[PDB]
Every structure is written in structure tokens, then in C-alpha cells.
Design a protein around this ligand. Structure first.
Ligand SMILES: O=C(O)[C@H]1O[C@@H](N2CCN(C3=N[C@@H]4CC=CC[C@H]4Oc4ccc(Cl)cc43)CC2)[C@H](O)[C@@H](O)[C@@H]1O
Ligand SMILES: O=C(O)[C@H]1O[C@@H](N2CCN(C3=N[C@@H]4CC=CC[C@H]4Oc4ccc(Cl)cc43)CC2)[C@H](O)[C@@H](O)[C@@H]1O
Ligand SMILES: O=C(O)[C@H]1O[C@@H](N2CCN(C3=N[C@@H]4CC=CC[C@H]4Oc4ccc(Cl)cc43)CC2)[C@H](O)[C@@H](O)[C@@H]1O
Ligand SMILES: [Cl-]
Ligand SMILES: [Cl-]
Ligand SMILES: [Cl-]
Ligand code: NA
Ligand code: NA
Ligand code: NA
Lengths: 589, 589, 589
């Protein structure tokens, strides 16, 4: 349930197992032949952490269907056996099956949130054979959802019901860390914060399942007990593009753990998004965890380079489309002060794409209880695990339950209501919750008008709908955006963009050129600025990223402001100039 | 002196400290203000391992001159203090200065080979402040050599006397590992190997400062004592493009260590390069450790992707131009069976570039003992550390003492003779030694004709010399190559190529197009095939890589067969087709 | 009816009116305000010949709907009025309306074949105001056919039912030439040719509505009368990639005209295409008249450069997709010996694209006699004018009645039968006739199985149908191609290809890369080579060309082997290498 980020501490080890491992694609006999008992024969090599799809050559390897087998020896000196020995998989995409010495000792479903297993038993002395089997199959029981054909259909292999590539393998690091036999399992810190003062102060309610410091390291307070409080006069507020992390050192019996924490408040008021009781405006992008050749595999240099590029562009936020990102990127946004919209793996809960699923002649609606999505029981686990992991991040400003689901369809409200409730139940900060809405929903039809504190739109007026007629597409966008203002809620665009192949130009623009992309964003942004209830623009996407092959995809999705190697297209200088004249707070009040 | 690659063992920990650290550029006051004593104020963030140059924005950051300060807290539980606690910096480019709790506890010069320091003392209990200061200054005392102007001169900042970018910072991982208070410090394994038999067998002399296994893990022998021997009948030979690693588990008192070892032989005979007493032919490239945005920082996914690309292209070798590569890439070449020419940091020992260095009107010759290179004392340490690190790699087939030095100049022979001798003294396998020769040397003038077992040429007939006249450049290449045959030694080309901007084409080629690059290699390769003493072609470069800015460099060096993101130019399919019809052994005999 | 190419002769002038003219877009009032009577006010400038769409900036100009007005003064000295003064418009796209001094004196429909008008009357003395009004509207009465929406529909403006841009304006030159009051109006020359001899000879039946020369200019024969004959012993055959043009100087009363003529024979025999009674194999492309910025406007330098590129690539043929090309390019193919498949303007006679045309709920079939295409009466004129213009070209080897019509639909056979009959009636050489068949037709369903001497296919197995699965697409292509062999007729592919953005690469190819395009053609060509009745491959397209904007078109059609500026993609070197090992005659017999 609780996943504290493993760190070197006075009582905890941290043996990163990352490196080149043994690796073999399953041919369909890996389990009956029980490869996880003996070392892998005729093995290949594969570095972890990384998606494996792009790391060898050949369509049979990249488009492989099914299982793969990682393997690696591990050994602990016996003087360490006095402590707990837990193996924490930061992510395994999609389905993991961890064997140790031939014995199955863990299973996990969901390829973007951490999970651990105790190793004290089953850990012989000497060299131990650790095998991790990884499955990539997606279907109606997985998040993200796998369809029965390509998303372009109707216009043995996986068929993503989502517009990105099904990168799989050990996406994030596999580490080993120790704890004493009586350990800290979780920490929770909320902040009630008094703004009546001219010099605002704070009250920090915590709850351990304890010392406070400042940015430098100066000790400022101490308290006993599992539950307690800290009172900070003249407290320093964590703010967008101006972070400040206090340090919280929680000493229990024979175990210490330190957690950075940012002091800030998040509150919706009418048509206004308030961070520290100031009217915020989102500037930024939907991102992907997508680099070359790591695939989805974690890349800490790119994370820092992306964040640099952001501050260069005068952005302040992004959403973790369309899955929870790595812990490291979350802590980084804490240090660098980048506003994050944390989103679940719930993309493709919408059976109107992919041509469609049919039964006895009739088309299957999304939430058909016997032939439709079978994802809600798992959809709930994800909301639980994601909020348990990221509950303490001052950068996490709003939760996103799903990306472009069948929001306006029969069965939709009953599907999302318990998920929205579960989200507000478990988030101790009671943060805003939302859903990122497919094109085609209206204020009346969208079940997000009821459940969500913020309306997040994905609209492509001037690309899919209207292109290349930007004049017509403008009056379309104004007409729908006007009608959204009647909810009295805040509206932001979480996706808008036009595919642009870097290098293509015309003085009289056509689609796919850099000129058109700039004109597209000019037209959209002009209409955004007309409505005081629009509190955010986030372009799609930050950077070109890989997808499944299709007529509609020119070597991936090309809607990025930057190329896959982070080089700027002309639009990136357009946005940099616009976002430079737009503040973080009080844009239009 | 001895650097065994740290691994998880039954007696040794491995706590990788890699992650985001604190980071600050020095402004010139970092040492008088003693930043290494207290946590860094106004700090930035930086991931290790990585070169820092490309990870923030701004020419002042990328072209920074001098020092930077990394910082990070470290903590070990006290039950671990019973063991040795050693901190191993895999590489720090260029000059490292490791402080702990404010106390200077290590220094190192040379930014591409490992170095460690004991942490048992100075390691308080609790949270310890670990600071690493990194200097990037290059001059006549450094390897690589820094000049006084750009290499294009004559046609406060560093000026590389080498054609690549001066990426600096913590290039390779920083880890912590433990050993018992009586530990293994080094292992050495040579192989005398009997080919008179129809089923060749082997004798494995080892020497520890002990059990044998096969590829799977089946135990095959055991022996007592520090020095001993193994006899393997029907031994399996490590071979190019067909690796096989035995496992050697050396158990000493309360400490175990495992080392993979490949059984093969390397011997020069006349005009023939023999691996396992067969006539080898080199196919491949000079490489760089260059990726985006890591800079020189280690990238294990790219290493695997590069090696995949190699086997796709039917290559078999590369040289580590122009510095020793990471341990991980060396072990990978052991697993994947890739022939490596291991090269020192000795590039730029040649003062005829960069316009030149002048004194009282007269130009300074390279090996002027008072105004020239001051590098030999350090040049010797590098040969010592590099051979101590890579002595056991079956993939390391020949050593390269320097890249394009002033090989035919006054003082040259006296400079290189002790280095060549030192190389053969310390390599227990007595492997071939060479020097990669600048253009302009001849068989008579090049001091490598005496010292080297293999003649390695860098020739650009059809680019720098002769372009765009490939007809003229051909008869130039034949005329010089003929004269090299009189030494009766093997000759390979370690560098040849033409800058090619991906995407530029003409049916009637001009320079910088993909057509010209292909025609260039066609002309060169035609002349190579005429001479039975040519035993290898290695193109320059594997991939486009970053350099200092200059009129002659179109956003880096563009001589790669692949782009910086490893996408193939047309020449890469040309070479793949040629190398497919050329075997590894017995090409022409 | 008869259009001899105007040339400088001993009795005929040739005053090319090409240059910058006055030009104005109609706003809807140009005719009621009668702009053709007085010089154009507020005029713009425009060069003729050229398409006007790309020659100014702005989507309103490029996508203009309706009329434009050209204007220019013309003046003839009165001593020339003793002769005929005829104004010959080589092409005006689409609908021309020629005024002189304000009086309407000609009209023409069809924007790709020549038409003339006599100027002896209405030609005052002094400066005469010549106005040409040009209309671009396309609909169900035009060839090419204009639809009611974009071709991507169902997945005030023109909507091409064809995949190229609707370039309009004075496409080809406007010239003035004179004749005496009793003139030559037409010349027709057929060749019966005796191959029983070891040194074949010829008989040249002519017919004027007369002297013979050879390549140099040596006179070889003479004859009187309108109808006559020439007997050439040891005649030199015009051949593919080896042209030879005799010269025919026809002197009548006070008028001389010279016409080049090539002696060759064209005959279908079973599954064999015979030129000079030898078994031919087509190598080449579907082309376009498309360059920058001329649009469709004639470009003689590119024609020569394209033909050079062809001979560089070892091509031998192309088709004039999808309209008759310029006279100059036809005469050039005579000189350079390039085999041409002459095709009419009949593209888009197929109402299954563009989403579709609907009436009372039911969809309109193509050849619905009241709501479908209204093109046959004009379709006949085009066949008449095209064969009258190009009847004498030895390079014109087969006629193409239409490109991808609804060949397998109700009403189709009755639509095409009179067109096919008309084609064989008026071609004195009785040359093969064909139809280029959309994907989806089979040997049974395609009405071209009956009417056509050669089966011409457009198939995209591995792009539109099957991509990116080339394995599956292969067995699809073999299965359909096998079934075509049962007609015992010759089968060639007039179109196959994959969109490829120059510069995109992967070692593991995906769609739109240069690697995929090469693999696509490898798979297709492998299946072509399996069937002795396949007598030709012609790739689509020769070069990237402009189209209307759509999601499916990355700045135009990118299926070219070369870019729009004729620079080669990787596939162009693939084809050059293949076509080099494939002869013109007797490929497989
Ligand atoms: O498209 C993009 O760039 C990004 O936009 C968002 N959505 C994508 C799919 N969407 C589609 N909407 C259609 C809308 C209208 C008709 C058919 C539709 O059927 C298709 C068919 C193929 C494809 Cl590819 C997309 C769609 C909705 C928008 C996602 O959040 C991103 O992950 C994605 O990458
Ligand atoms: O050049 C390349 O691509 C690769 O080739 C090799 N060498 C580079 C420098 N070399 C030069 N030779 C000159 C040769 C003739 C006249 C002046 C010379 O002065 C200059 C001036 C500027 C530059 Cl940039 C290069 C040189 C020798 C070849 C290196 O091993 C690589 O590291 C390098 O990347
Ligand atoms: O496409 C190309 O590159 C070239 O190929 C030929 N034809 C194009 C249109 N064709 C289509 N066939 C579809 C086939 C299957 C389903 C829908 C179809 O609906 C569409 C929709 C949009 C477009 Cl764009 C094309 C088509 C048939 C092939 C033409 O001779 C060329 O002029 C053209 O340029
Ligand atoms: Cl977003
Ligand atoms: Cl090399
Ligand atoms: Cl064609
Ligand atoms: Na975009
Ligand atoms: Na090169
Ligand atoms: Na093509």
C-alpha cells in the first residue's frame, strides 16, 4: 500500500541492481520448460532499467507479443541478514512475475507504479538466481486498454487503444534496500497555513505509520510521537518557479528516514485556480516518458534537460500523460518548482476508437457490463497506489482520473463516481480531481461537469477538426468554449496541437509545416485569452514521441514543440515569447 | 593501482550513489569561501553520472571555465562499519577533489579511468556531507592536451587540441562497496592454449593478490592457493562475433569475487593479425562516448543499441577513440564478442595543430623539453591504470598509446619508447601495441614503424586531402599505402571519412552529401583491397558527435555513418552490404 | 481538330507572347463590369506560361475559387497581315475565354490540350488589348473530376477527386504564328516495316491535309502529291534508349513544314509487349508535370533534368499521369528515346472516393445517368484531341483512357466501350489501348479485362493495404497477381509506392522512412519477377508533388523516388541498381 522512495539513510542500504542482465524472448515454452529455475541458455543481453523494444534490431523483436525473461545473480553478505531485505521494483511494464531460486515470490499488475517483496526467506546464502518475467499483453482488463485492431481501423499482436508505443520491460530501476525489523512504513504530512498575517505562518500536521530542517540544514524544531505538529512562523512557501523544500528527519526505533516537503496550499474558488491563495495560470504541456533509445525507460539526464528547457521557455507545469511518471522526476519537480498534474494509467477506456468492438451485430458500448471494459476494479488500485506514492509532493496540484474516456456515454458516470470519491477519500490534502475530456463532449453531456473541480479539455480545432481552415475552426472553438463557461468552473486545455515535421516550411503555410503549427497555436491562444474562466494552456506535446505504425503517424507523433532529441521547432520560440509576457499568478483576474 | 569492477558478491555491497545531486558552478570564490564544508547555497540540480555541459541552457554554462561543485548526503548504518567502506569514482572529468565532512580526502588527475578512496575514517555516524569538486581546465600538462587557441587557428576559455567537445563533470558512476578487512585486491588470468590438437585445449594460469564454471554455471574445477592453474580439455574459444565467457569464482578468506574470462590468443605474424591463430580482418569504426544529452556520461541503453547496430551492420571491432571507455561497455564487448582496440587519453600530443605555440619568434616543437608537452609522466600513469583495469578482457586485442601525436618529429621516439616498453612490461598477455598515426607521416619518418607491431593510419584522401577530386586522391592513397607495405607489418586504417549532413543529396554528388560519402568509401575501400598487408578497415566515425564550435564543424563532427541518434545515413547501408560479403577470418590470405 | 506543333519555318513566324502579363483575380464582378474591354485597373503581375497558384502569398490567393484575368498588349506590323495570323494557346487550365479588343473570339474546355483561333479579323492596326480569362472550377462535368468534399471525407471551394493540386492559369505557352492563305493543316505518317530481311527496311505511308532526310541532314528521297510513300532500305530503327529521328520536310504551295519521325513498330502478342518485334519490359514511373514554383506550368530545364536523371537510373519509360504533357516534352522523348504511355485527363471518374455523393439516402453510383458523371461527351473530345496531337510520336507506345475509374461498376463497360473504340478508330498506328485500374478490381470484375490490350495496375500492397506488414501484403499481392495471369494478357504495374519523408531513417524501419520505402519495393519487385506475363514496373511517383491539404498528405504526396527538387532518396539508388541488371528487351522470355 505505502511506497516511500528508497534512499541511503543511517539505517537503510540501497543496492541498485541496474546494469546489463541476461535476457531472452519467450517462444511459448518458457514456462513449461521452467527457464526461471536454471540460468538462461542462448541468452541475450539487456540493460535495466529500460524498455527493451528499441534495443535490438528487427520487427519481430520490436513488435514481440507476450513474455520476456530477465535474469541476474544477486548476493548479500550474511551479516546483512539481521535486517529486512526488500526488493523494490520501481516499475515493470506491464505484468511482472518475480522468481527467486526458481520459486515464484511475487506478482504485480500495472506497469507504471512501484511494488516490493520481502527477500528474507527464499534468500539462500551464496549466489541467488533472480528471474523477472515480463508480459506486454494489453486488452480490456489492462490499464492502458488494448483493443482488437489499430486505432485507425474503420477509417497475434497487441493493438494499443492509445496513441503511444507499447514500450515494455523493466521500465524503472530495480533496487534492494534494508530496514531494521521494526521500520517506518509510511509518512504523511499536510499543511494548514495562515494567510491572515502579513508574514504568513504554517502548521504541519504529520502522521507516521521527528525533526524539521530548512533548505540549508539548520534544525528548527523537534517533536515526539507518531502523530504530531510543527509550527513555523514566517514560513517559506513553496511556489511555482520558486521552490523551497524543508527537510523532515523522522527518527523511530533504530531507523531514520528523511523526506523533503514543500509548504503550499491548493484551492478552487469559482473560475479560479488558487495556489497559495493566488490566481494561477497553467503554462506547459502534456509530456511523455519517451526518449531514444530508452523507450519509456527512465532517463535522468533528459528529465533535467526537459526541466531546463521548460525554464528556458517560461513554462510552469505539465501533466503526466498518460501514466504516473518516475519517482525521481517527481522529486525533481519538487526541487525545481514545476507544477504537475498527476495522471493515472487510464487511457483507452473508450471503445469508440479502433473502429470498434462488435457483438451480435450491435456495437459494444464502452461500459457494457459483460462485453466492455473490465478495468474498474484495477482502476481503483491505481488511484490507491498513485496517491499513496505521490501524496507528499508539493508539485502535485491536481489528480487526473483518466485520459479521454467515454465521458458522455451510458454507464460512464457510474464508472467514474467511485473513482472520484476514492480519490478525494485518500488524498489527505483534498486536492482537485479531474478527467481529461475527449473531443465531442459538451458541458451538458460530459460526466466530468459533475464530478470534476476543473474542466480539462483535449481539443484539436484546426487539426483533426477543421484543418486546414483555421478561420472556420476558430468559430468552432469559440462556440464550444463559450458553452463551457456556464458551469462556473475553471477550464484549461490539456491538449491542443498540430503534427509538424521539423524542417518543412512554406511562406504560405500548409499542414505539417512549422508555419502552420505556429498559426494553429496563434488562433487557439487568441480564443483562450477571451475567457476569464480559462486558467491554463498546455500544448500537446512537449516533444515528438513514438507510436504504433499507421498512415496517420509520420514516424511517431509529430505534434511536439521540440523534436525527440529536444531540439526546438519554430513553435517553441513562439511559445517562449508568449509565455514570457504571461505571469504565473494573476494572468487575468 | 588495481581496479576490479565492483559487483554484488557474497561479501561485498554495492550502493550506487547515482541520482540528482546538488550542483553549483564556481565563480572563483568557492575555495576561499569553503563551500565543501557546508551545504551548497543557491544550489542547482544535476544528475550523476553525466557530463554537465548540455544539461542547462546558456553559453556561459556550456562553455564554463574552471570548477564545479557536486554535493550529496551519504549515510551508512553502523553495523556495516565492521567492513571496509571504499568510495569508487568510475571517472571524474577532468580533475576531481573529493571532500568528506569538509575534509579533503582524495585527489585524482585524468578524467577517464577509475580511482577509489577509503571511507572508514572521516565517516562520522549520521548524515555525512560528500562534496566532489570537478575541474575542466586542459593545457600542456593534461591528457587530452589543451592548446592556446582553436584547432582552426592559423587558417578565459579552454581550447581543445582535439576534435571533440570538452564534456566534464562526473562522467561515470559514483558507487560505494564494502570488503572484509582482508580482501581480494586484484586478479590476473592468462591463457596458454594448445592448437596442435584437433580439439584444442587450454591452460589458465591465474594469480590473486578459486573455482571455475562454464557459460551456464556448471562447476568444472577447483584449486587452492593464490597462484594456480586450470586445465580445460575441449576448451570453448572466445571468438569474434561468437563470444563465450567462463566464470571464475575466487574464494579467499571471508571474501568471494567472480570474474568472467574469455579464452583466446592474439599474435602478430608477418603481415597477418591472428586471433586464435587465424588471420583476422577488422571491420568497424572509431567510436566516441557521445550521446544526447548525457554528453560523455555513460549511457548503457545506447551501448547495447550501438552493439546491436554493429551486429546488424556485420561489423566486428571498434577502437575507444580517444580515451578508455566505461567498464560496463568493456564487459559488454566480452559478452557480445566485439573486438576492441583500447586507447589511452593521449590525443593532442601534437603542437602542429591550433595554429601553433610560439616562443621567441620560433615555433615550439611538440617535444621541446621546456616549452612543449609536459605529459609523459602522466602519460605513463594512464598506460599503467588502463592496463590494470582492462588486463583480463578477451575483447581487448591491441593497445593504442596515443592518437595522432607528432610521430615524425624531433623528440618523438624518445617520448614514446618508454611508454611502449611500459605497455609490454605490464600487459601479462603481451598484446600488440600501436599508435594511431596522423596524416603526413611516412613509413620512413613515422616513429611507429619501429615501436609498433601494427601500423594504424588516419588518412583522409578525398576529404581534407584531395576533395572533391576522388580520382587524384586515389592515386595519392595508393602511392602512400604501397610504401607502407615495405615494413612487412600489418596495416589497418583506424580513421577515414567525409562529413555528411543527413538529408543532403545530389545525383551528381558534391561534398557533404550522402552520395559523396558513399563514393568516398568506395574509392578508399577499392585501394585497401589491393594490398594483402591491409588487415582492417575502421570508418570514422560510428556516429555524429559534438565538438567545439568552428567554421569547419556543422553542429559537430558529421563524419558518422549514423546520426547522433543512431539513425543510418546511406553509407551505413553501403558498409552493411560490403561487410556482409567480408568474413572475420581469412578475408584474403 | 489538327494541332501541328508551331515551329520557325521558311513560311511561318513564331512570336512567343510569354512574359510578365497583367493579372487580376475576379471578385465576382469581372464580367458585369466588363474588365476585358479596358486595361486592368489595380492590376497584379503574373508570368506566362505558369500556374498562378504558388506565385503570390496567401491562402486566399492559392485556394482562389473561380475566374482570373490575364491581359497583355499585342501588335503586328501591317506587312504581316497578308498571311494568316493564328493565336495558339498550348494549354489553359481549366476553362479559357479569349477576348480581343473587348470581343469574345474563342472558348475552350479542357486544360491540358492545345487550341487555336484565327486573328485576321478583329485585329485592328496598332496596339490590341488581348485578354484571357481562366476558370478553375471542377465538378462532375470536367476532366479531371471535381467532387463535393475532400478525398479523405468519410474517413465555396474546389474539391479535387484526384490526388494532386488544382494548379490553374495559362499552363503552357501562348504563341502567335503565321501561315500563307493556303496552308498545311495536318500531317500523318505510319510505318510498315519488314523484319524478314537480315537488314530490315521500311515503307513510310504519309498523308498531308515532301522530302525525307536522315539524322544529320542528308536528303534521301522526294515525292509529289498529298499522299505518297518512302522506301528506306537498311532503315535505322528508333529504339528505347537509342533514338533516331528522320526529318520530313513537306513543301506545299508557298508553305514548308518539317516534322521529325521515328521508325518503329508496336505489337501485343500473348503475354508479351513487342517494340520492333522484340519483348519489351517497362522501367520507370508515373510522373507529374509538377515543379516549384511553376506548379503545372511548363519547365523545359526540369524536363531535360528529369530525362537525364532517368538515363542515370537506367529507366526507359513513364506515363503521363494524369493528363497529356507538353508538346516539348513529347518531342524531347522522341530525341532522347524515352517510352511514353500517353494518358488522358480522365482521373476522378470514380465516385467511390471523397466519402461519396448521396441522393435520396441512396449513394450515387459512378455512372448513374442523371446524378453521376457527365463527362463522356467531353471524354471523347479529349481522346480525339490527344491522338490528333501526338499521333506521330514514336515514343507514344500505348494510350491510357482513364486513371482509376470505377472500372468494375454498373454502367462502366457502356461508358468506356465507345471511348476504346474511338481510340482505335483514330490512331493510324493502331497502338495498344489501356486503362489504369484502381485497387479492388479483379480479372473477373474489371471491365478492362475485355477492352484493354494491356492490363495496367495501381496496387499499394504494403502501404494503404497491409502496411506495415510486408509479409502479409506479399501473399496478398501474389494471390491477386496470379489471378491476373489467366487473361493471357500482358500485365504491368503503373503505380506502387510508399510515402517517404526524405531524411527519416531507422535501422529497424517504420512507415515513412527511407528504409521502409526500399523494403516495400523489394517485396513488390520480388513478386513481379515470379510471373512471365508481368512486362513492366513503373513506380509512383518519380518525384514528390503538391496536392490538396489533408491529414494523409505530409506537405504533398511523398511517394516520390526523388524529392520535388529532384534530389534522390535512398530508394532511387536501389532502383538504379536493380534497373541496371534488367535489360530493355528480353528481360524474361
Ligand atoms: O492525436 C494526438 O496527437 C493526441 O491527442 C489525444 N487524442 C488522440 C486520439 N483521438 C482521435 N479522435 C478521433 C477524433 C475523430 C475521429 C476519429 C478519431 O479516431 C482517431 C483515429 C486515429 C487517431 Cl491516431 C486518433 C483518433 C482523440 C485525441 C490523445 O490524448 C493523445 O494521446 C494523442 O497522442
Ligand atoms: O577530422 C576528423 O573528423 C577526425 O580526424 C582525425 N584528425 C583530426 C584533425 N586533423 C587535422 N589535419 C589538418 C590536416 C591538414 C591541415 C590542417 C590540419 O589542421 C586541422 C585543422 C582543423 C581540424 Cl578540425 C583538423 C585538422 C587530423 C585528422 C582525429 O583522429 C579525429 O578526432 C577527428 O575527429
Ligand atoms: O495515393 C497515391 O499516392 C497515388 O495512388 C493512386 N490512387 C490514389 C487514391 N486512392 C485511394 N484508395 C483508397 C483506397 C482505399 C480506401 C480509401 C481509398 O480512399 C482514399 C482516400 C484518400 C486518398 Cl489520398 C486516397 C484514397 C487509390 C490509389 C493515384 O493514381 C495517384 O494519383 C495517387 O497520387
Ligand atoms: Cl496536459
Ligand atoms: Cl579506430
Ligand atoms: Cl505510370
Ligand atoms: Na503541436
Ligand atoms: Na565518414
Ligand atoms: Na514510392
Amino acid at each position: 500500500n505505502a511506497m516511500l522512495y528508497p534512499v541511503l539513510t543511517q539505517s537503510r542500504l540501497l543496492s541498485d541492481l541496474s546494469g546489463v542482465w541476461n535476457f531472452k524472448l519467450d517462444n511459448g515454452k518458457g514456462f513449461e520448460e521452467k527457464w526461471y529455475e536454471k540460468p538462461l541458455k542462448d541468452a541475450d543481453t539487456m540493460p535495466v532499467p529500460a524498455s527493451y523494444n528499441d534495443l535490438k534490431e528487427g520487427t519481430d523483436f520490436r513488435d514481440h507479443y507476450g513474455w520476456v525473461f530477465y535474469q541476474r545473480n544477486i548476493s548479500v553478505p550474511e551479516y546483512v541478514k539481521s535486517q529486512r531485505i526488500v526488493l523494490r521494483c520501481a516499475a515493470v511494464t506491464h505484468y511482472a512475475m518475480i522468481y527467486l531460486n526458481g520459486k515464484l515470490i511475487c506478482e504485480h499488475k500495472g506497469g507504471f507504479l512501484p511494488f516490493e517483496v520481502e527477500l528474507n526467506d527464499d534468500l539462500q546464502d551464496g549466489d541467488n538466481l533472480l528471474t523477472i518475467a515480463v508480459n506486454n499483453v494489453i486488452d480490456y482488463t489492462t490499464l492502458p486498454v488494448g483493443g482488437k485492431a489499430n486505432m485507425m481501423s474503420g477509417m497475434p499482436q497487441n493493438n494499443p487503444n492509445f496513441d503511444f508505443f507499447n514500450y515494455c520491460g523493466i521500465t524503472r530501476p530495480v533496487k534492494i534496500y534494508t530496514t531494521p525489523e521494526t521500520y517506518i512504513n509510511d509518512i504523511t504530512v499536510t499543511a494548514d497555513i495562515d494567510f491572515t498575517k502579513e508574514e504568513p505562518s504554517a502548521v504541519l500536521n504529520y502522521n507516521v505509520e521527528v525533526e524539521l530542517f530548512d533548505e540549508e540544514g539548520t534544525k528548527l524544531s523537534e517533536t515526539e510521537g507518531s502523530e504530531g505538529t510543527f509550527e513555523i512562523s514566517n514560513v517559506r512557501l513553496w511556489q511555482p518557479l520558486n521552490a523551497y523544500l524543508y527537510k523532515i528527519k523522522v527518527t523511530a526505533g533504530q531507523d531514520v528516514y528523511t523526506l523533503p516537503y514543500g509548504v503550499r496550499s491548493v484551492r478552487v474558488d469559482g473560475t479560479k485556480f488558487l495556489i497559495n491563495e493566488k490566481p494561477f495560470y497553467f503554462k506547459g504541456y502534456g509530456k511523455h516518458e519517451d526518449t531514444f533509445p530508452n523507450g519509456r525507460g527512465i532517463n535522468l539526464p533528459m528529465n533535467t534537460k526537459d526541466i531546463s528547457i521548460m525554464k528556458w521557455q517560461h513554462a510552469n507545469s505539465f501533466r503526466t500523460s498518460h501514466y504516473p511518471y518516475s519517482e525521481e522526476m517527481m522529486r525533481l519537480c519538487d526541487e525545481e518548482g514545476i507544477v504537475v498534474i498527476d495522471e493515472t494509467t487510464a487511457v483507452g477506456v473508450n471503445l469508440q476508437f479502433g473502429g470498434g468492438a462488435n457483438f451480435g451485430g450491435e456495437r459494444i458500448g464502452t461500459f457494457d457490463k459483460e462485453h466492455g471494459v473490465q478495468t474498474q476494479e484495477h482502476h481503483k488500485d491505481v488511484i490507491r497506489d498513485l496517491i499513496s506514492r505521490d501524496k507528499n509532493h508539493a508539485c502535485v496540484v491536481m489528480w487526473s482520473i483518466a485520459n479521454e474516456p467515454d465521458s458522455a456515454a451510458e454507464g460512464a458516470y457510474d464508472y467514474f463516481k467511485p473513482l472520484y470519491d476514492l480519490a478525494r477519500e485518500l488524498d489527505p490534502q483534498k486536492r482537485p480531481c479531474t478527467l481529461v475530456s475527449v473531443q465531442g463532449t459538451t458541458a451538458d453531456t460530459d460526466c466530468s461537469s459533475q464530478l470534476s473541480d476543473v474542466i480539462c479539455l483535449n481539443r484539436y480545432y484546426g487539426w483533426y477538426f477543421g484543418g486546414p481552415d483555421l478561420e472556420v475552426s476558430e468559430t468552432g472553438l469559440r462556440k464550444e468554449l463559450s458553452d463551457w463557461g456556464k458551469l462556473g468552473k475553471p477550464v484549461m486545455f490539456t491538449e491542443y496541437g498540430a503534427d509538424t515535421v521539423s524542417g518543412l516550411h512554406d511562406t504560405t503555410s500548409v499542414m505539417y509545416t512549422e508555419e502552420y503549427q505556429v498559426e494553429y497555436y496563434e488562433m487557439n491562444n487568441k480564443v483562450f485569452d477571451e475567457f476569464d474562466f480559462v486558467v491554463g494552456e498546455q500544448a500537446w506535446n512537449f516533444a515528438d514521441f513514438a507510436t504504433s505504425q499507421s498512415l496517420l503517424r509520420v514516424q511517431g507523433n509529430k505534434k511536439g514543440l521540440f523534436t525527440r532529441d529536444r531540439k526546438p521547432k519554430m513553435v517553441a520560440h513562439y511559445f517562449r515569447n508568449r509565455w514570457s509576457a504571461i505571469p504565473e499568478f494573476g494572468y487575468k483576474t
